[PDB]
């Protein structure tokens, strides 16, 4: 089962998946600058991965099928990290970013079931 396999794979890796809010099509640029700031600002100990869950919708527009890289959850960024103000800086101070999508008040981490559901190729 790919679901169980990815569950086991993500069980061991450090960092709890979190969610961040972006501005519409300004998402891939957001992840670009985010992991680039991981490379540069020396915050590689926090952001272990950045994912824009996106299945490309091949739809029949303009008389032909065309893929649309819609971000399954548009405007949202799934980023694996820890409780660090540095990762908050590197994401929420990055371009095309609005803030961390907390549950009640502070940022909350997606349950591993949901992140496995949305990180699995559709």
């Amino acid at each position: 089962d790919p679901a169980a396999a990815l569950k086991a794979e993500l069980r061991s890796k450090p960092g709890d998946w979190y969610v961040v809010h972006s501005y519409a099509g300004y998402e891939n640029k957001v992840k670009a600058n985010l992991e680039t700031r991981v490379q540069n600002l020396d915050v590689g100990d926090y952001i272990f991965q950045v994912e824009v869950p996106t299945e490309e919708v091949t739809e029949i527009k303009n008389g032909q099928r065309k893929q649309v890289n819609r971000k399954v959850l548009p405007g949202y960024i799934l980023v694996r990290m820890d409780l660090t103000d540095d990762s908050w800086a590197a994401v929420r101070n990055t371009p095309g970013v609005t803030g961390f999508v907390g549950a009640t008040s502070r940022p909350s981490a997606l349950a591993l079931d949901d992140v496995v559901k949305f990180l699995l190729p559709r």
Binding site: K29, A32, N33, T36, R37, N40, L41, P95
Partner: protein, 49 residues
């Protein structure tokens, strides 16, 4: 702000001054001032005075 942003999302040894500078904000603020300001007033030309 744009140049500082682009200063971290482009590889070194390919950056040049002309590829980091976007004039748009400046040429836009100048027009904003000279078209849509309370001080850039349509001149009164009733008589020379």
């Amino acid at each position: 702000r744009v140049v500082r942003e682009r200063m971290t999302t482009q590889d070194v040894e390919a950056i040049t001054p002309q590829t980091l500078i976007n004039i748009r904000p400046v040429v836009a603020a100048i027009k904003e001032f000279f078209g849509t300001s309370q001080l850039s007033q349509f001149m009164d030309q009733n008589n020379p005075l």
